[PDB]
């Protein structure tokens, strides 16, 4: 997505994604959800940019995704 070392998820964001915002026994939709994260972050960067890094916990994920698409089989 053309980004550089200026935004990063923890594994709290990974738990947020696996807990709500995807359901699959593979990595294609996970790739697509991370692409959604990267595109929302790139547009929010080029509108108003932050400084240095930006760590993504489970708080920053619903500000980028909002919409679950495959709710998991809990």
């Amino acid at each position: 997505s053309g980004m550089e070392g200026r935004i990063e998820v923890t594994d709290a964001a990974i738990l947020r994604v696996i807990s709500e915002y995807t359901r699959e026994a593979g990595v294609r939709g996970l790739e697509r959800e991370l692409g959604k994260i990267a595109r929302k972050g790139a547009k929010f960067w080029l509108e108003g940019a932050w400084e240095g890094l930006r760590t993504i916990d489970a708080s920053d994920i619903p500000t980028y995704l909002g919409i679950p698409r495959y709710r998991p089989d809990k």
């Binding site: 909002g66 919409i67 679950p68 709710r71």
Partner: protein, 47 residues
């Protein structure tokens, strides 16, 4: 009256419509069936 898991389907709804629609969210049929009836009976039953 819309199901509970459809609460995060609402972001493509227009806000001018979302401000016009008093959307209720529900978990169970027992929530709906005491929400839509009128409490009194009107007609005689079969039995």
């Amino acid at each position: 009256v819309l199901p509970k898991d459809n609460e995060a389907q609402l972001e493509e709804l227009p806000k001018e419509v979302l401000e016009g629609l008093e959307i209720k969210l529900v978990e169970d049929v027992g929530e709906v069936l005491e929400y839509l009836l009128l409490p009194e009976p009107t007609m005689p039953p079969v039995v």
